[PDB]
């Protein structure tokens, strides 16, 4: 329904091994379309989706420029972080930043994203109002003084509400066939032995898109949460996703359990039982 464009930056320092690595990946919803790796022989923005390859040289060159600037900036960010937390120059550290825009149904910015972490923990994040910052600790508040002083939030809001949404719309149009699609999952229930008096009912949903999906179990109409196991939604590698949810059920009680699937590709939510 509503769409989004998100960029993911990862900067990894490595003392005694030269410059830090900087990867940037672009996503429209659950589909990657651009990459940039400083550890490539010839660093440059590359296409990872077919609907972006037809972009003019200007696009790729400028994107490469921005990527390089970001890389340098984050290389500085790592040292700065070393100074803020008073850390040694020997350890390896990581900075991650996710930022993007949720294009709402009204065609306006439903939600804006700009959040970063240090060594896997919240650092600083742009708030919902897109005017204020939330700093995780006293070290991030330095950066906060900095970004408030330069009115960074205003600029970034300008980006999110404008260029971000616009490029998102363009991407949605050029890749309409693969981006604006809702593929329902192929579902099925399997039985597995566990105990002399117990078994496992595994509910399968395969080849669906987008990733968002709801897989549940019910016992005679009443939701069932105990003895359940729902694996993290996984990629098929072909632009689809997979997911299964299992339940441990006493032998002879199989018929009393049902699996419920919700996905935007389904006209109506599914109800499944184990079939001979």
């Amino acid at each position: 329904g509503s769409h989004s464009m998100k960029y993911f930056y990862t900067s990894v320092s490595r003392p005694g091994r030269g410059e830090p690595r900087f990867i940037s990946v672009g996503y429209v919803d659950d589909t990657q379309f651009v990459r940039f790796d400083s550890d490539a022989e010839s660093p440059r923005e590359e296409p990872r989706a077919p609907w972006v390859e037809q972009e003019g040289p200007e696009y790729w060159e400028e994107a490469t420029r921005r990527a390089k600037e970001a890389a340098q900036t984050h290389r500085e960010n790592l040292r700065t972080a070393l100074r803020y937390y008073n850390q040694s120059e020997a350890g390896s550290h990581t900075i991650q930043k996710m930022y993007g825009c949720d294009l709402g149904p009204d065609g306006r910015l439903l939600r804006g994203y700009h959040q970063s972490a240090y060594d896997g923990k919240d650092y600083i994040a742009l708030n919902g109002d897109l005017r204020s910052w939330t700093a995780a600790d006293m070290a991030a508040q330095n950066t906060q003084r900095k970004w408030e002083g330069n009115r960074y939030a205003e600029r970034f809001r300008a980006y999110l509400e404008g260029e971000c949404l616009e490029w998102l719309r363009r991407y949605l149009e050029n890749g309409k066939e693969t981006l604006q699609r809702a593929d329902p999952p192929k579902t099925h229930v399997t039985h597995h032995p566990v105990s002399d008096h117990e078994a496992t009912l595994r509910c399968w949903a395969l080849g669906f898109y987008p990733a968002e999906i709801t897989l549940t179990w019910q016992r005679d109409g009443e939701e069932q949460t105990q003895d359940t196991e729902f694996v993290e939604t996984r990629p098929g590698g072909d632009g689809t996703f997979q997911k299964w949810g299992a339940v441990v059920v006493p032998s002879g009680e199989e018929q009393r359990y049902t699996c419920h699937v919700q996905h935007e590709g389904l006209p109506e939510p599914l109800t499944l039982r184990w079939e001979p």
């Binding site: 921005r66 900036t73 700065t80 950066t143 900095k146 960074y152 970034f156 260029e163």
Partner: peptide
């Protein structure tokens, strides 16, 4: 496309 703005820490 990525953002033009990326202020230092």
């Amino acid at each position: 496309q990525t953002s033009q703005w990326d202020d230092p820490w």
